[PDB]
Amino acid sequence: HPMAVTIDYWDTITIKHKETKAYLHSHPDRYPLRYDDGRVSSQGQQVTGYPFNDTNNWWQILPAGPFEEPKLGRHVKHRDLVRLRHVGTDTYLLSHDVASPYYPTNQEFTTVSFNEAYGDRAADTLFEVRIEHGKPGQEFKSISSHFKLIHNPSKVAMWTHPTPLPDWGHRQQEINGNKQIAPSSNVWLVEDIVSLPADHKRRE
Ligand code: NA
């Protein structure tokens, strides 16, 4: 497929849910302190699934360890640990054992600052890219690498479903951590390497 290209660290990408077609998304709005059932959220930045194309779908895929200046040509591979930086808010994807908006059993997904992501909350910002049918050393590619995104501390899978969030979440889809990895509803794909120009050698 001409749009199936190996993804490199520091690329900016869009991440699309295979079954619902929603894009992984974020924006400045926060989770409410209390849900209707009385549970308490982290009040962190919302992470949602959004059906349309906009800049709030853009995430930069980054390495898992200490901060380093950008390098070119470092391919992401099956089962690598990664961070995902939301470009529009300059925050870092995080999950933790706080119950999600609609599923008391599933982990909340949110974002955190650079200082948190490379400091005391670093472990909670690491996610494994588990390619469906992946083999050791296999390169992660746009379009063709269907994958599950596994939170490294807890082994929950990033998940979504169709029933929209309330108005506080802009009636977008919930994103949370599924305790079961096997379901096909845990499958995502990278639709576009946004940062990689159309004339770049990597597309040849
Ligand atoms: Na582009």
Author numbering: 334 to 537
Paper passage:
Protein O-mannosyltransferases (PMTs) are conserved endoplasmic reticulum membrane-embedded enzymes responsible for the transfer of mannose from dolichol phosphate-mannose (Dol-P-Man) to serine/threonine-rich protein substrates or unfolded proteins. PMTs from three subfamilies form obligate dimers with different substrate specificities and require the concerted action of their transmembrane domains (TMDs) and a luminal MIR domain for catalysis. Here, we present structures, native mass spectrometry, and structure-based mutagenesis of the fungal Pmt4 homodimer. The core fold of the TMDs and MIR domain is conserved with the Pmt1-Pmt2 heterodimer, indicating a shared catalytic mechanism.
Therefore, we purified the ctPmt4-MIR domain from Escherichia coli via a N-terminal hexa-histidine tag and solved the crystal structure at 1.2 Å resolution by molecular replacement. Therefore, in order to be able to compare PMT2 and PMT4 family MIR domains from the same species, we additionally purified the scPmt4-MIR domain and solved the crystal structure to 1.3 Å resolution. Aside from minor conformational differences in the β4−β5 and β8−β9 loops, the scPmt4- and ctPmt4-MIR domain structures are highly similar (RMSD 0.87 Å over 194 Cα-atoms) and comprise the characteristic peculiar β-trefoil fold i.e. six β-hairpins arranged within a pseudo-threefold symmetry (three MIR-motifs: MIRm1,2,3), altogether forming a β-barrel and a triangular cap. Characteristically, the Pmt4-MIR domain structures reveal a unique β-hairpin insertion (β-ins) of seven residues (RY(D/E)(D/N)GRΦ) in β2−β3 of MIRm1. β-ins is extensively stabilised by internal hydrogen-bonding and a central salt-bridge between the conserved 4th and 6th residue (ct: D370:R372, sc: D364:R366). It is fixed on top of the cap scaffold by hydrogen-bonding of the tyrosine (ct: Y368, sc: Y362) to a glutamate (ct: E441, sc: E434), and of the centrally-fixed arginine to the mainchain around a proline (ct: P434, sc: P427) within MIRm2. As observed previously in the PMT2-MIR crystal structures, the Pmt4-MIR domains are extensively bound to small polar ligands present in the crystallisation solutions (acetate or HEPES) or cryo-protectant buffers (glycerol or ethylene glycol). In particular, the α and β sites, which were demonstrated for scPmt2 to bind O-mannosylated peptides, are again occupied by ligands in ctPmt4-MIR and scPmt4-MIR respectively, in-line with the expectation that they are also sugar binding sites. Given that both the open γ site and β-ins of ctPmt4-MIR are also bound to acetate ligands, these too may be mannose binding sites, which would indeed provide an explanation for the importance of β-ins in O-mannosylation by Pmt4. Furthermore, the ctPmt4- and scPmt4-MIR domains have an asymmetric surface charge distribution with both a highly positively and negatively charged patch.
